[PDB]
Write a protein that binds this ligand. Structure first.
Ligand code: SF4
Ligand code: SF4
Ligand code: FES
Ligand SMILES: [Mg+2]
Ligand SMILES: [Zn+2]
Lengths: 115, 125, 48, 96, 689, 54, 85, 208
């Protein structure tokens, strides 16, 4: 439909405002997450990971998609603040046990049939 | 009032699929071919969307067929080619569309088996 | 069994075996099918 | 009738036996290979051939409801026996 | 005009003469049937299709009764349901209990129609009938107790395959379908009786007992065993090619496939190349790594350049691999690129597609009035093209005329001599067949590409082009009808020609190469005797037949069931085969191997994905990426004018096809030679019994 | 069980002596019976309360 | 500098290739007879503009758009490629 | 009599049809369609923005006292423009009856939360969100209920694979459970069970 129902934020400006508010909320939480969960990472590493997770959705140009993304981000944050998660999930954000997947054509050709 | 989004729909960031299986997957939208072993045509009514085939290897123990592709068994049913194309586009996968093949109408006549001067006459019944 | 002995078959085991787990007599699984793909065998005679 | 491979490993009734250079033979070290010593092909060969004076015979495997579904075997080709394939049982018309 | 009938009260407009079954199909109802096949004649004996007309007191066989004006067809009426139940009851009353041991199993029309239209209980309290099994070859396994005497195999045999060795012997309940003698039903189209037999009486013998229909995964790909490009379906199970089935394409395949296509899938499991191979100090081939093999090949490629680099393309190569190899060889200014099949390069040559394409499509044969076959055996070179010719012959009284060797075609044809002297005479007009062609409204001239392999292929091509020109001049020039045609017999030939490969290995023979890339080249046209001493050979392929024994480096590749690839058939239509399984062992995709070799050599190619390689294919020739389209431009005037300028003399040798018999049909290429079933077929047709 | 061999399996003796019964047993244990299109919500008084299935 | 092959892509139905089709119709035979050993590959396009590819030595290729050209324009462009100017 | 055929209830069918007409007349603004299945189950298809008014009417109206929210779920149909189909099953104890209310929505369109009408809607809508990705506007606490913490994707969608994309195991190097891409020792075997012969003539569709 031409007149799509907005979740909120109307245009993209208010969506960006909500994105920045959620980013501030996550940024001020990383020291507490490191302290409580007794993570062995640095605070800088946690902030960098929050920044990277925010940046992987930087190409979104739909206000409704942005609103859903910030809703799910707030959900993830409230999981972390209430210590509902464990160190398991917080470290699952880091993919610490995966082998470095090759990205060049020659290495992909050598390892297997993966495109 | 009600906002307007003059852009193509895209829910790839919300579906949760990994980027590898979003970018490097080419689905196939088509109407399945009739199973040649049967004359029934009721399985060639709806369009189907299926993914490309990935590697399967042999399990070192018990010799089973292992896999590493999550979307190996994922087949979706769509009533129309347009519906399937829209779904594939909004989910971000590549897609190849194949047009439905319907048999051409044919002229059948029982009396052609006994033609007076044509080769259509049959030598047995 | 003393009053009603079971039917005797030529394939039924004569000696019963208990649970042999934890012993060198334990069951070990394996594939019961042969090799699907035959590899090409290059000639033993050099071409030159 | 079990047979021994050149690597010393018994062959099953399906002909399964790892090659000499196969690493998977290590699983049987300090343990045993589960092989059934009774071969159905050998046993059914041991079974004789029945002779009935009719063109068509009916086989259900014996026992009635305990056997296989009833099938009919046509005993017209005298150069070979008619084999019920559910149970692999051979029937034959009395020639001569 | 169309008449108006009714199906369950719904108005349908149908042509006069349309059957009740066809009217119901048009409205959307598939009437149950056993003996009825749309591609076969109308038999009307199984009586399963009986339906009720609204006022008629008697049910009518829907497969044979033409509709009349104002007929209301009651498909789901009580009378129709009772008739279907009775017919199914009789069929299953005499049918045997073999479902668990019967390969038809879960894809049985008798089972499905019993479950959808018949009762669920048996009133048969008597003994059943047992029928002696027959033996009609190593391909079809017959358990004739399961036959329902639907006469599909007989009708198919006669009408389609032109072989009348099947029929019913005796009468009554003792009627049996077979040969009545120990004769094998050996023909190049004998698997379609397996396909169309509604019950398990006729089943595939190589596929016997292996799998069940619900387990198989169906991958829709195409065929590469010949140049017809038949549409097939590969049935796999746990990553293994289990079966090959026809896929309907009425303009190419039409639900039928040849036996070589259907039963040579087992050749993909033997003599397979699975690891890269090099040669040690003693000259014996040993397995190695991709890195080492590609490093050696890249070192040689960097060492040499110019026309000292050659590629020979085999018969099962794809457009992606061909274009990748062409670009790789052009990166070193080398141009000794050739295919192992000769096409006359004098005049237009490969410049015009309407000079080596089958200008009238396969479906266009049904519209032709007269057809003239020159130097070909379509029964074995392209069995489905011959089947289409047979269909046109039967249903239109087509006048088939064959110049040259009197092969056993499946229909009556006019045999014109054995030499191209008749070909010259027809062009001149002395032969009466010149008058026949001139009077014919729609003539067609098909020159088999097997005749172009002769030393005077250019002269034969010029002669047939002159015949087509004479036809065009005398007849009306106006019209979209195309006369001149070339029938190919190699899957990769048309794609290679479109890309720009020089046909035939004459360039290699003229200038021997220091480095030779055999891309699936198992034809044996070029050997180390022709090549100079210390020549470096890299064979890239999926089977080790000739090139692998005579190569220095061996690169395993993928088959048509194992790669997504582009093949162009003899009429110019492009098609893509999809991935059914993955290449075994360390084998990789062909274009991927070529691209990796280029990257190691330092002349990296500009494509890294299948989409980019097909974009390169589009750059070279967009017809390679327009898939289902077959229409093209006609440049016969230019081709004929260029062929006229240079002329040579026809050899005084009779035209003899390479394949004169069904054994020659069975053994044609690498997969067929590696197949066990093809060897069994050859033994059966040679030694008999 | 409902005396409808297109829904419920027949007896072993009927399967091993009747062609229709064998066919129906095969189809019921390989493909299963087809259920006409439609949606239902049926609830019962299970011991823990209303247990329902949609 | 060293030409290796030349390819012409012309859509069959689109009016933009009317001039290109004229060159093939009544000028190709003279051109090919002038260059017997030059591969001139004629192919068809679907909806893209007509194009003229020229593959030189060591895999160097250039494409020239032939949209809305006439028979004279196509002849002059092809002569320019053959000449090297 | 037919022992194997379920008997029909014309009385209940007529009562349900009359009540469907009643509600359709009362609320023309939202009621798009009314149906009564042949096994006596009333269904009402309404516009998605009428959920609160329709549920409040069916709960508080004297002639429709559907006090109990029996069930609340969603059905995913990818071929539709609005794939998600929200279903409410209501029970009326006073009149001893059941009703069904069906609305439609897609990924990005919220559905008004019905926790002000029935309290069970809280957890039911939490489950709907967790399993399909449908967002409910005024939910007191909307979060995952059944999936793992930090789980990505909504499992019950038709396009979500059966085994998912990740699997868990204990990694001794990091002394914790880790999530790694899914990899099955034996792949799930897909069976094609549909027969190619039409089973029910009554449900045949026009060929179009
Ligand atoms: S042909 Fe059909 S009905 Fe007959 S035994 Fe085979 S599966 Fe059963
Ligand atoms: S063998 Fe098969 S195709 Fe031939 S008549 Fe019998 S049932 Fe029909
Ligand atoms: S289908 Fe008509 S009688 Fe057989
Ligand atoms: Mg069959
Ligand atoms: Zn038996």
């Amino acid at each position: 439909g031409t007149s799509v129902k907005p979740i909120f934020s109307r245009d993209m400006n208010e969506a960006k405002r909500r994105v920045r508010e959620l980013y501030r909320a996550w940024y001020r939480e990383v020291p507490n997450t490191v302290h409580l969960f007794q993570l062995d990472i640095s605070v800088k590493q946690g902030r960098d990971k929050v920044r990277e997770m925010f940046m992987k959705n930087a190409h979104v140009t739909d206000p409704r998609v942005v609103d859903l993304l910030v809703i799910k981000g707030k959900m993830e944050l409230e999981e972390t603040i209430n210590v509902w998660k464990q160190r398991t999930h917080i470290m699952r954000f880091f993919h610490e046990t995966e082998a470095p997947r090759p990205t060049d054509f020659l290495s992909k050709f050598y390892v297997g049939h993966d495109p | 009032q009600l906002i307007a989004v003059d852009e193509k729909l895209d829910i790839t960031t919300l579906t949760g699929v990994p980027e590898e299986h979003i970018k490097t997957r080419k689905v196939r939208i088509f109407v399945p071919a009739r199973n040649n072993m049967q004359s029934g045509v009721n399985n060639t009514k709806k369009w189907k969307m299926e993914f490309d085939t990935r590697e399967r290897w042999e399990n070192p123990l018990m010799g089973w067929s292992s896999t590493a592709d999550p979307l190996s068994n994922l087949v979706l049913t769509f009533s129309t080619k347009e519906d399937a194309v829209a779904f594939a586009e909004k989910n971000g996968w590549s897609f190849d569309v194949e047009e439905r093949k319907v048999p051409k109408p044919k002229s059948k006549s029982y009396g052609a088996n006994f033609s007076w001067n044509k080769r259509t006459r049959v030598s047995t019944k | 069994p003393t009053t009603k002995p079971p039917t005797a078959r030529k394939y039924i085991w004569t000696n019963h075996k208990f649970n042999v787990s934890g012993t060198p007599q334990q069951y070990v699984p394996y594939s019961t099918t042969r090799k699907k793909i035959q590899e090409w065998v290059p000639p033993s005679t050099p071409y030159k | 009738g079990v047979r021994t491979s050149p690597t010393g490993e018994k062959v099953t009734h399906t002909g399964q036996a790892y090659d000499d250079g196969d690493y998977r033979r290590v699983r049987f070290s300090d343990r045993q290979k589960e092989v059934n010593e009774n071969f159905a092909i050998d046993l059914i060969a041991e079974q004789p051939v029945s002779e009935v004076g009719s063109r068509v015979i009916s086989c259900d495997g014996g026992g009635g409801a305990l056997g296989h579904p009833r099938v009919y075997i046509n005993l017209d080709k005298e150069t070979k026996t008619g084999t019920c394939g559910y149970c692999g049982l051979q029937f034959r018309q009395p020639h001569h | 005009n169309l008449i108006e009938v009714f199906v369950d009260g719904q108005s349908v407009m149908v042509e006069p003469g349309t059957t009740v079954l066809q009217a119901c199909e048009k409205v959307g109802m598939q009437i149950p049937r056993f003996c009825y096949h749309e591609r076969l004649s109308v038999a009307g004996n199984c009586r399963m299709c009986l339906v009720e007309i609204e006022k008629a007191p008697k049910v009518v066989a829907a497969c044979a009764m033409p509709v009349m004006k104002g007929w209301n067809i009651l498909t789901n009426s009580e009378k129709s349901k009772k008739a279907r139940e009775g017919v199914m009851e009789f069929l299953l009353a005499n049918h045997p209990l073999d479902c668990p041991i019967c390969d038809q199993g879960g894809e049985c029309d008798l089972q499905d129609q019993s479950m959808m239209f018949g009762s669920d209980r048996s009133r048969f309290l008597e003994g059943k009938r047992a029928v002696e099994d027959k033996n009609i070859g190593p391909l079809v396994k017959t358990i004739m107790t399961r036959c329902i005497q639907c006469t599909r195999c007989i009708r198919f045999a006669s009408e389609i395959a032109g072989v009348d060795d099947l029929g019913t012997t005796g009468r009554g309940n003792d009627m049996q379908v077979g040969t009545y003698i120990e004769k094998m039903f050996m023909s190049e189209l004998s698997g379609n009786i397996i396909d169309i037999c509604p019950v398990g009486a006729l089943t595939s013998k190589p596929y016997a007992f292996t799998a069940r229909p619900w387990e198989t995964r169906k991958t829709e790909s195409i065929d590469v065993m010949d140049a017809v490009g038949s549409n097939i379906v590969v049935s796999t199970r746990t990553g293994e090619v289990m079966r090959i089935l026809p896929r309907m394409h009425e303009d190419i395949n039409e639900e039928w496939i040849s036996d070589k296509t259907r039963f040579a899938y087992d050749g993909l499991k033997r003599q397979r190349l699975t690891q890269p191979m090099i040669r040690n100090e003693k000259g014996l081939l040993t397995y190695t790594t991709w890195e080492d093999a590609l490093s050696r090949v890249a070192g040689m490629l960097q060492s040499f350049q110019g026309n000292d680099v050659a590629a020979i393309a085999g018969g099962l190569v794809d457009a992606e691999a061909l274009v990748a190899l062409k670009d790789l060889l052009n990166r070193v200014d080398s141009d000794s690129l050739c295919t192992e099949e000769v096409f006359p390069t004098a005049g237009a040559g490969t410049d015009l597609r309407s000079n080596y394409l089958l200008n009238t499509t396969i479906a266009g044969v049904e519209e032709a009035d007269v057809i003239l076959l020159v130097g070909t055996n379509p029964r074995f070179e392209a069995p489905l093209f011959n089947a289409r010719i047979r269909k046109s012959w039967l249903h239109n009284d087509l006048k088939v005329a064959l110049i040259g060797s009197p092969v056993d075609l499946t229909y009556r044809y006019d045999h014109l001599g054995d030499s191209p002297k008749i070909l010259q005479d027809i062009a001149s007009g002395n032969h009466p067949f010149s008058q026949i062609l001139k009077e014919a409204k729609k003539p067609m001239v098909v020159l088999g590409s097997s005749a172009l392999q002769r030393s005077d292929g250019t002269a034969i091509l010029a002669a047939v082009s002159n015949i087509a020109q004479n036809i065009r001049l005398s007849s009306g020039v106006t019209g979209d009808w195309k006369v001149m045609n070339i029938l190919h017999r190699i899957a990769s030939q048309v794609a290679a020609l479109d890309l720009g490969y020089k046909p035939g290995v004459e360039a290699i023979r003229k200038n021997p190469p220091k480095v030779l890339f055999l891309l699936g080249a198992d034809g044996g046209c070029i050997t180390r005797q022709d090549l100079p001493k210390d020549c470096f050979i890299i064979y890239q392929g999926h089977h080790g037949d000739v090139g692998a024994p005579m190569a220095d480096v061996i690169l395993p590749g993928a088959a048509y069931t194992e790669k997504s690839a582009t093949y162009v058939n003899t009429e110019g239509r492009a098609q893509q085969t999809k991935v059914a399984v993955t290449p075994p062992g360390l084998a990789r995709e062909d274009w991927k191997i070529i691209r990796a070799l280029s990257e190691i050599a330092g002349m990296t190619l500009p494509y890294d994905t299948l989409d980019q390689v097909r974009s390169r294919l589009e750059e070279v020739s967009p017809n390679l990426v327009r898939y289902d389209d077959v229409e093209g431009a006609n440049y016969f005037q230019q081709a004929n004018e260029l062929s006229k300028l240079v002329n040579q003399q026809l050899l005084a040798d009779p035209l003899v096809p390479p394949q004169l018999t069904i054994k020659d049909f069975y053994m044609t290429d690498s997969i067929s030679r590696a197949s066990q079933t093809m060897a069994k077929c050859v033994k059966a047709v040679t030694e008999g019994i | 069980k409902v005396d409808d061999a297109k829904v419920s399996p027949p007896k072993r003796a009927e399967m091993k002596t009747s062609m229709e019964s064998l066919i129906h047993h095969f189809k019921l244990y390989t493909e299963g019976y087809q259920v006409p299109p439609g949606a239902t919500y049926t609830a019962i008084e299970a011991p823990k309360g209303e247990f329902g299935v949609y | 500098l060293g030409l290796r092959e030349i390819r012409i892509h012309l859509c069959q139905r689109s009016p933009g290739s009317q001039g290109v089709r004229d060159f093939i119709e009544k000028r190709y035979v003279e051109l090919k007879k002038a260059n017997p050993d030059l591969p001139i590959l004629i192919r068809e396009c679907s909806d893209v503009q007509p194009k003229l590819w020229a593959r030189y030595a060591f895999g160097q290729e250039k494409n020239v758009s032939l949209n809305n050209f006439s028979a004279d324009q196509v002849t002059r462009t092809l002569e320019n490629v053959l000449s090297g100017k | 009599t037919r022992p194997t055929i379920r008997p029909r209830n014309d009385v209940v069918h007529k009562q349900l049809s009359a009540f469907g007409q009643y509600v359709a007349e009362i609320l023309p603004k939202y009621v798009q369609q009314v149906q009564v299945s042949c096994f006596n189950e009333l269904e009402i298809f309404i516009h998605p923005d009428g959920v609160i008014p329709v549920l409040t009417f069916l709960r508080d109206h004297t002639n429709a006292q559907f006090k109990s929210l029996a069930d609340l779920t969603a059905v995913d149909v990818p071929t539709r423009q609005n794939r998600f189909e929200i279903v409410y099953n209501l029970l009326s104890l006073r009149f001893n009856s059941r009703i069904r209310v069906k609305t439609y929505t897609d990924e990005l369109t919220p559905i008004e939360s019905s926790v002000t009408v029935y309290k069970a809607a809280n957890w039911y809508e939490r489950e709907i969100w967790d399993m399909f990705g449908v967002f409910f506007a005024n939910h007191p606490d909307l979060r995952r209920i059944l999936t793992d913490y930090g789980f990505e994707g909504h499992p019950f969608r038709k396009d979500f694979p059966l085994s998912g994309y990740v699997e868990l195991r204990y990694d001794d190097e990091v002394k914790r459970v880790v999530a790694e891409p899914v990899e099955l020792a034996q792949e799930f075997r897909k069976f094609d069970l549909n027969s190619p012969w039409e089973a029910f003539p009554a449900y045949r569709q026009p060929p179009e």
